[PDB]
Design a protein around this ligand. Sequence first.
Ligand SMILES: CCCCCCCCCCCCCCCC(=O)O
Length: 389
Amino acid sequence: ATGPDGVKQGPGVTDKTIKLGIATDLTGVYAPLGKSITQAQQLYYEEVNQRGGVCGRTIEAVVRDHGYDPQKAVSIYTELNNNVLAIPHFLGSPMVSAVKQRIESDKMFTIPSAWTTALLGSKYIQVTGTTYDVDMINGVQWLMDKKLIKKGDKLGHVYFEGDYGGSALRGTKYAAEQLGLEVFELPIKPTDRDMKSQVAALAKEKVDAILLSAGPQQAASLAGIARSQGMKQPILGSNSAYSPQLLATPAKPALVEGFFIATAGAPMSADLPAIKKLAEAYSKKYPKDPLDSGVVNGYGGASIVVSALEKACANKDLTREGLINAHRSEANADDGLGTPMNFTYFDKPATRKTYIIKPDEKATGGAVIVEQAFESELAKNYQVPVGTF
Ligand SMILES: CCCCCCCCCCCCCCCC(=O)O
């Protein structure tokens, strides 16, 4: 329990090692993005280890694949929880929801790649960036500002049922109420591979804009089918409704025009020194794995946990209490990757600024900024739910 350097050691911490857990999707709908996130975290931890680790201890990240399935995530959580100090990458809103009570009981610092409001309200869970609702509020306001929609128009929102799509949808509906828009709602599951019935329904409803809270496979299908039907409505996706791999498929033309993504994260093409450095470092380590916005997300999550570990080390306290208090002492985080945040609270989003990006085969990371990160008044005044959607 206390190392020979006088540092208190919690679960997963020995005299020479700090074990961290990663619960991701390597095989399901988010496979290429979970790979990128996971590899970017490993890149960060390797760089740290090369510089002597933390508190003289090497960081070891153990990786489990839940396949974007909540029951498997639970099983994985119970296999890791007594033997890792923290979980700096846990992919997926329903997956982390399923273990929220255990996280709280265990005092497990968890950094999801998941942005539901259902994960707010826990000291131990850092929801990074914006929440999904705030991204759709910003995004709908942007559609109106850009005259892609007007008062009285109808939005069709295709969404993964539950925490992720439902949170996004909450934002859509708030914006629609405030702005005088109608909403047509289309729930889907991650196992729905083919969007042609959804496209048919969107067309029947004569929507003016199409919103999507799903993964890359659904985005390719929906965009491709819509454009093959002559639909000209803009498409606005949540932050994970795209991977650059899709540009190497016939969906490309339906993604590089008329398709936008609302996200708190900067793409790999942003003109920031830390982004350029990351692009070079990641490309060097993993030459065969395309750069994507998951790389940014994973490197950033690793940066968050390491910052907290270093502060906890300096307090001679690599326990779960020491770690969370180190993390929650940071009111002004800015890792240089394009998403400044405040970590001292957890009853509201860490930021309310959303970028609009689009797919671009010419750009580093397969995407470019269309609108620099902004917080609409609409989003600023919105009441964000805490621990539910
Ligand atoms: C700064 C934070 C926003 C960064 C967004 C980068 C997108 C990376 C890909 C994420 C894949 C995971 C999707 C999870 C969907 C869900 O919430 O269940």
